[PDB]
Symmetry: D2
Subunit: 193 residues, 4 copies
């Protein structure tokens, strides 16, 4: 019964990920056409696993139903935009939000206000129209925009998360020196363009 | 020259148009299968016109050799071909796509209802599509050739007769065309009844 | 326990499908390079679902273990080569078997000896070396080679299989007239090359 | 001429070589992750040399402008770049690939152990690969550039300094190179300990 509703959820949010991905790749493709630089290194897509969706609903004391999840959970559809340089992150943000049918919903900038452990990434939730066979759906998609250095750090830290406390200090040490080397590559890249 | 640059610009933006068309179409196919357990689309082929065939077509129509003329007058710069599993899937795809707010019909030629003299059959619609670029919006036409697998199989062989040698197989092609429609009608009739 | 063995099975037979697919596409790509014709229309790959694998093992009274399935089941890895013309089928067969590291295991030609219901397809099982991280595996892969007409017929018939008996007769009727129209396209295509 | 045809032949067969190399490499990456829950490869890039850059390289080395010479003397006609997640993954990929019966080492240059003067770092191996064509077998060389993500990030920026402007950033590049190796050493050291 309810499970059908969640299967429906997985399907339409997968479609949302397709329309965003096409938008993003066109922006990357056109920017390189004009300025001979690719802002995007690569992208990863993911529809939230159901058991993680149910876990998150319970952590927030919410009902286990697809319509509740559709309301309260904004990262059912997630895309991760790994960029080549630090300024490419905000370039992607500007290019996408300027589009008529893209609506900002949430913005959390962990680059300028990093988490305690050193995590850095730009998180924006945007709305996207998805034209289905017999219906239109405007669905939220969480976009994690980051540099390659931020991505490699987040990968190592993710795989850890009672073994976090040991490496917590020098992970933050790595985080810091990743930002410093990427700052230096950015300043060089800024100057050659 | 500046023009050749213009044609490179043309190839780039019409390639992007094909990306947005393809995502729309595959979502429709994916959602229809989700609801009704049937895939209207068998496969799709994309193509941006070669510059050298684009220049040929401009000259064949007595038009100027410029990107601004080509954008206006040539509607098959971006081409997508939607090969469908059954004949009724063709018009289903058309209906589903045109009802979308940002897709506008521009040209329609129904060679299924009114086949060509040689037996060619296909639905040809040109639609307009918004393409959001880095610093600009472009609304671009895309020619969609919607057809069955049988129609595709026939059109491939006929295309490979050309390139004074069409007259020989003209009759024997017209027979293949006819018997393709007849067998596909019957598979359509069976598929309708079991759904 | 045993389930681990079947997970291992799925992984290595998936890799087998990758090496075959690369072989087949190179052959198709080279044939078109030389003769300006593409024998292959498209291909579908599939590793057998486990519950269907366990079902098949029970139907044959065999043990439910990965090593037994690896021996007795030759269609764990399946690839389907849908060809443009009838003669392309045997062209693909010739091109692939001539390769040094491809070994024929089983051949059943349902084109010349169609099944009672009208099914037609060339079925060959071949062996393929798969170089893994720390080990080599020579694995069987079932190849179903057919025309587009044979494929469309098989699709309609598969989806139906107590409702087979009704359409059984005119399915065979369709089967026959598919072969006749494809014969005529073949004779024309033979003559233009 | 007949030659230009020869170079078209060259592009075709070396593209096929890249397909067999890629399938081997991805299977190794896929199997290693299956066993040890780690992906050595982050991503891969493929490339067949442009004919016009191939002609340039032949002239730079005083060689004849023919496909038969290029096949013999130029080993980076087919190029693949294996970007790895950690430094030790680089040599792991090399070991796994060369131990295969039908892969033969042809050339090896280890710029990781002996970096270039500007700070470039990467493992360069040319290997031979059998390519089974429709009517013929070809054993073709493929140049493999194996590197970390940091090495890739650095090499991209340095490549975009060229194309009398390298001297300015030469020192500041050499620093970036160094601190990339140092941060990647530490991430390697952490990753080793948690496995
Ligand atoms: N926007 C995003 N896009 C692509 N992948 C993402 C992503 N967010 C997380 N991932 C990755 O998807 C995998 C599974 O994530 P989940 O457990 O389902 C949600 P989460 O990462 O815990 O975010 P949450 O804390 O907001 O709920 C993780 O390994 C993560 O790295
Ligand atoms: N909408 C479309 N979708 C997919 N492929 C198409 C297509 N239109 C043409 N093609 C294919 O592109 C290849 C080269 O033909 P082109 O010159 O580019 C267009 P055309 O078919 O010649 O239209 P034209 O007769 O008005 O000039 C052909 O193989 C053709 O089948
Ligand atoms: N060699 C093959 N390659 C690709 N797909 C195949 C295939 N053989 C069968 N399929 C398709 O895979 C889907 C699931 O097949 P399965 O039920 O797992 C085995 P099967 O089709 O019953 O063959 P079997 O009777 O020899 O056991 C079917 O819909 C089928 O059309
Ligand atoms: N093994 C390889 N794998 C992936 N990309 C490669 C590659 N070798 C070169 N490339 C890329 O191909 C693009 C054009 O360079 P090419 O002229 O084709 C070869 P090259 O790097 O100039 O070698 P060369 O200096 O010996 O001539 C560059 O962006 C380069 O990074
Ligand atoms: Mg999240
Ligand atoms: Mg046209
Ligand atoms: Mg089978
Ligand atoms: Mg080189």
């Amino acid at each position: 019964d309810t499970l059908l509703g969640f299967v429906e959820l997985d399907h339409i949010y997968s479609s949302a990920l397709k329309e965003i991905s096409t938008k993003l790749s066109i922006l990357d493709d056109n920017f390189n056409h004009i300025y001979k630089h690719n802002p995007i290194h690569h992208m990863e897509r993911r529809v939230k696993e159901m058991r993680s969706l149910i876990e998150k609903l319970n952590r927030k004391g919410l009902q286990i139903s697809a319509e509740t999840a559709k309301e309260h959970i904004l990262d059912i559809a997630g895309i991760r935009v790994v960029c080549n340089y630090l300024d490419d992150i905000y370039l992607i943000e500007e290019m996408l939000l300027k589009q008529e049918d893209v609506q900002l919903i949430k913005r959390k900038d962990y680059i300028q206000h990093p988490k305690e452990n050193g995590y850095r990434s730009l998180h924006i939730v945007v709305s996207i129209p998805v034209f289905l066979a017999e219906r239109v759906e405007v669905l939220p998609v969480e976009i994690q925009i980051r540099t390659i250095g931020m991505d490699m750090w987040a990968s190592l830290e993710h795989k850890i998360r009672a073994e976090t406390e040991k490496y917590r200090d020098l992970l933050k040490e790595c985080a810091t020196e990743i930002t410093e080397v990427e700052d230096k590559l950015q300043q060089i890249h800024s100057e050659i363009t």
